[PDB]
Each structure stands twice: as structure tokens, then as C-alpha cells.
Design a binder for this molecule. Structure first.
Ligand SMILES: Cc1ccc(-c2cccc3cc(C(=N)N)sc23)nc1N
Ligand SMILES: Cc1ccc(-c2cccc3cc(C(=N)N)sc23)nc1N
Ligand SMILES: Cc1ccc(-c2cccc3cc(C(=N)N)sc23)nc1N
Ligand SMILES: Cc1ccc(-c2cccc3cc(C(=N)N)sc23)nc1N
Ligand SMILES: [Cl-]
Ligand SMILES: [Cl-]
Ligand SMILES: [Mg+2]
Ligand SMILES: [Mg+2]
Ligand SMILES: [Mg+2]
Ligand SMILES: [Mg+2]
Ligand SMILES: [Mg+2]
Ligand SMILES: [Mg+2]
Lengths: 229, 8, 229, 8
């Protein structure tokens, strides 16, 4: 814990500043520090944690795909493979760090549905990112993602309205998992359709501000369905 | 090409 | 030298891959490794070195300006100042690293005008970035930038055509130095005008490909003149 | 606002 000497509140404040400065590696290190204070995270703090690591790992995933593509082109010197391995290793270390925060001890202390579903979604996401680069224990990684996503689905279906943005973002990502990772395009399509339709039928209950949040994610479901069908 | 997932 | 065990050619190849992956911190570390092999750099290699560090420091400059602005707004907790100082320190370390490569020993071994002007321009640029964040020995930093830029100008005026893209990019940056750093807007305007006009009168000598390179930088001179007048 | 300088 490099951040062990900084106040929890200062870490959160600095995470917000780093976001404004587009310094996402800093943002993630600050939020890791906050998590390691051992207190549960608020809604805003969970989202800061997620945004920070999503941005960090997103940069690594984009680099890995560029390099993997080049590696494949030259296969149809060791340098492309070596550098792809370097980036791959850094990505895996980021995913392992996020999964370690969730395991020690965010998930076990999350009793409310909004926190527990949020963290289980994250666990599915970061196993999915590991699965994207995996070859050998790819099967066990895939099943770890599936299991986390499914537990999050089961809770969100019992505890959250169908328009809840966390539930919608969960279903969106689990759908992509099904399509791209588990080679289950029909499951992906069914999940996205059923999610969209049940959300549609619940929008009448929402305030204008909730409506905006939910319909934004529904559009992402529709966007994928359009590509998939 | 990447399909839409949640967040940035 | 973390990169001391990698071949010079592999470092260059990996710098090019990192550029494709938009991994500019990696790109700079690879090019620093290549410089430290002690051989002179080719034209392409100099540009790889410059692009890499320009991207790294550009991200730090943008963050510093965001944070400096926030710091000022709250002045008209210590966290904004502390984090601005952190970023500022990281920026200064990058500038110091680049200046150390130029001093040990790129500049002293650069005998051709195209290499010597390129490196002296860089030295001016990285002193300018230090000047942007300086307060106290700001005067000595400013004079170090001025001196490097001026030596580059003197050589380029004796040894390069007025359309040479290195000469044009030098004059562009020295003009901005004059305007923003040295508070000499009239010098900045005169330099940009005289540079543009002498380049204009030399374009007739260029191939279609050289013409494209030169006129691109002339447009940047014109863009600034439009803001400045 | 930043004035144009050379490169990226
Ligand atoms: C009190 C509160 C504040 C913000 C949020 C929130 C919700 C969804 C996304 C998101 C992204 C954020 C960011 N990029 N900083 S904050 C945030 N939720 C709350 N309950
Ligand atoms: C769906 C959603 C997205 C963002 C936010 C949000 C709320 C409060 C502050 C804040 C700061 C942000 C930033 N600095 N990028 S996003 C954000 N809330 C939501 N319900
Ligand atoms: C042989 C050769 C190749 C490339 C260049 C070159 C020139 C100006 C800008 C620039 C940027 C580059 C990059 N972003 N990789 S290469 C490059 N010059 C040469 N003499
Ligand atoms: C003015 C100028 C800009 C770029 C280049 C250039 C040349 C050869 C290769 C290459 C690769 C680049 C990249 N991968 N971004 S730029 C570039 N040459 C020039 N004369
Ligand atoms: Cl490597
Ligand atoms: Cl700090
Ligand atoms: Mg405390
Ligand atoms: Mg590997
Ligand atoms: Mg079918
Ligand atoms: Mg060798
Ligand atoms: Mg300082
Ligand atoms: Mg006047």
C-alpha cells in the first residue's frame, strides 16, 4: 500500500482530480488506496473505482489487439511476440489487481443489491478481459466470468427493477460475454432482447432523469442486436 | 470490431 | 539502462510497434534505450525519439494545466496543490531525462546540420516545457531555451533551405516561445511572418512531396499569426 | 488556449 499514508478522503478527492486531468493510471492507484482503507465504498466511489480501471485496462486491451493483429499478419523476428507478451502480462496484472480488491474484501462485505451486483459484474468483466487473451486455462477463466455474471444476474432479477442501470449494464456485458467469449451468439441475442423488452415495459415508472440513464444503456443493447441480427 | 459494453 | 540487454535494432522495432499501439511511455523507454547504445541516430530514429517524448510530455502538460486551473479557481484542502506538484514533478523528470540524452551525448556527436538543428530544437522545447511550470529560476530556464533555439536558428539559416521542415518547425516553436514564455509577442509575430514569407518564396524549388511537408508547417505559422494579429 | 507548435 503505497497510498497507506494518505487519508481516505484525500485519495477520493485526488481520484476525482485525476479523472478531470485524464490521468487514469493515477486515478486507479488512488482508488486502490481508498479500497485498501478497508471501509465499504459508496455508490460514487464504486463508480470511480470502475471508471479508473476500465480506462487503464481499455488502453491495454486496445494495444494488445493492435499487436496481436500484427503478430498474426506476420505468421500466415521475436519482437512482435515479445512485446505483445509484455502488454499481455501488464493487462493480466491489472486484471489480477482488480480481482484481488473484489476478493479482499469488497464482495464479501457487500450486502446491498446495488453494491453486490456492481462488484460481481466487475468480477465478470475482469475475468472476461483475462479470457480475451487466454489460450490454455481459457476454459476455467471463462467459467469464472460466467459464474460471477450469473450470480449478479440472479440477484439483480430478484432485487432490482428491470430499468436499473446496473442491472442493464450487467446484462449488456454478459450478453457480449456470451457472444464473443463463450461462442453462444443465440444466448447473447436472447439475453439482449429480453433485457431490452423488460426495460421498455418499466420505463413508465421512471423520472425524466432515471429515464435518460436507462434508455442510454438500452441503446447499447439495441446497437449490439443490430450488429448480431 | 468490438461490441458495445458498459462504461468507457 | 533497463534496456541494456535488448538489441538496438529490437528497441527501434519495438518503438515502432509501441507507436502503432499508442503506447507512448513504452515508445519513449525503447527509444531511450536505443539512444543509450551510444550510436548516432538516423533521421527516422530521431523522429521516433521526438514523437515518443512529445506524446508523453504532452499528456503531462495537459494534466498540469487542468490541475493548475483548478488550483487557481480555489484560490481567488492541500489536495489540488499536492497533486499538481506530483504531476509537475513527473513532467520535470521527463524533461530532465530528454535533456540528459541530448547532453549525453546526442548534441556533441551531431555534426550534420539536420541532426544538430533537430537536437538543439528539442533542447529548446524541453527547456520551454520546464519554463511553463517554473516560478523561481524561471529566468535561467527561459534563457536556456532561448540559447538552444537561437543556436539552432543560426545553423539552420546557414545550412538549410527556408522550406526545410526542421527549420520551419524550429521557427514555429521558437515563435511560440517568444510569445508565451518570453513575453515578446512582437518578436514572435516578426519571426513567424519572416519565416512564412521566406518559405513561400522557396516553394517553387520543391517536389510535390516536399511541398506537402513544408506547406503543412507553414499553415501552423499562419494559424498562430491569425490568433496573434 | 495553446498556440500551434511542431509535432503531436
Ligand atoms: C452520488 C453519486 C455520484 C455519481 C454516481 C455515478 C453513477 C454512475 C456513473 C458515475 C460515473 C462517475 C465518474 N466518472 N466520476 S460518478 C457516477 N453515482 C452516485 N450515486
Ligand atoms: C449515469 C451517470 C453518469 C455520471 C454521473 C455523475 C454524477 C455526478 C458526478 C459526475 C462526475 C463525472 C465526471 N467527472 N466525469 S460523471 C458524474 N452520474 C450518473 N448518474
Ligand atoms: C527514413 C525516414 C522515415 C521517417 C521520417 C520521418 C520524418 C518526419 C516525421 C516522422 C515521424 C515519424 C513517426 N511518427 N514514426 S517517422 C518521420 N524521416 C525519415 N528520414
Ligand atoms: C512529415 C512526415 C511524417 C511522417 C513520415 C513518416 C515516414 C515514414 C514512416 C512513417 C510512419 C509513421 C507512423 N507510424 N505514425 S509517420 C511516417 N514521414 C514524413 N516525411
Ligand atoms: Cl518487449
Ligand atoms: Cl498527490
Ligand atoms: Mg484517516
Ligand atoms: Mg502470456
Ligand atoms: Mg438462430
Ligand atoms: Mg548489439
Ligand atoms: Mg514544483
Ligand atoms: Mg506592435
Amino acid at each position: 500500500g503505497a497510498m497507506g499514508s494518505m487519508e481516505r478522503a484525500s485519495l477520493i478527492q485526488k481520484a476525482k482530480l485525476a479523472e478531470q486531468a485524464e490521468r487514469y493510471e493515477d486515478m486507479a492507484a488512488f482508488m486502490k488506496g481508498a479500497v485498501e482503507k478497508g471501509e465499504e465504498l459508496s455508490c460514487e466511489e464504486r463508480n470511480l473505482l470502475s471508471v479508473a480501471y476500465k480506462n487503464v485496462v481499455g488502453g491495454q486491451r486496445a494495444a494488445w489487439r493492435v499487436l496481436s493483429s500484427i503478430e498474426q499478419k506476420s505468421n500466415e523476428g521475436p519482437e512482435v511476440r515479445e512485446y505483445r507478451e509484455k502488454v499481455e502480462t501488464e493487462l493480466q496484472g491489472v486484471c489480477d489487481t482488480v480481482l484481488g480488491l473484489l476478493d479482499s474484501h469488497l464482495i464479501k462485505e457487500a450486502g446491498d443489491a446495488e453494491s453486490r451486483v456492481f462488484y460481481l459484474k466487475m468480477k465478470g468483466d475482469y475475468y472476461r478481459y483475462l479470457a480475451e487473451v487466454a489460450t490454455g486455462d481459457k476454459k476455467r477463466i471463462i467459467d469464472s466470468a460466467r459464474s460471477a455474471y450469473q450470480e449478479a444476474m440472479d440477484i439483480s432479477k430478484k432485487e432490482m427493477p428491470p430499468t436499473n442501470p446496473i442491472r442493464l449494464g450487467l446484462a449488456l456485458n454478459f450478453s457480449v460475454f456470451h457472444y464473443e467469449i463463450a461462442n453462444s451468439p443465440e444466448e447473447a441475442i436472447s439475453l439482449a432482447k429480453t433485457t431490452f423488452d423488460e426495460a421498455m415495459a418499466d420505463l413508465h415508472t421512471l423520472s425524466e432523469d432515471s429515464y435518460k440513464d436507462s434508455t442510454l444503456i438500452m441503446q447499447l443493447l439495441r446497437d449490439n442486436l443490430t450488429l448480431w441480427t | 470490431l468490438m461490441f458495445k459494453t458498459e462504461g468507457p
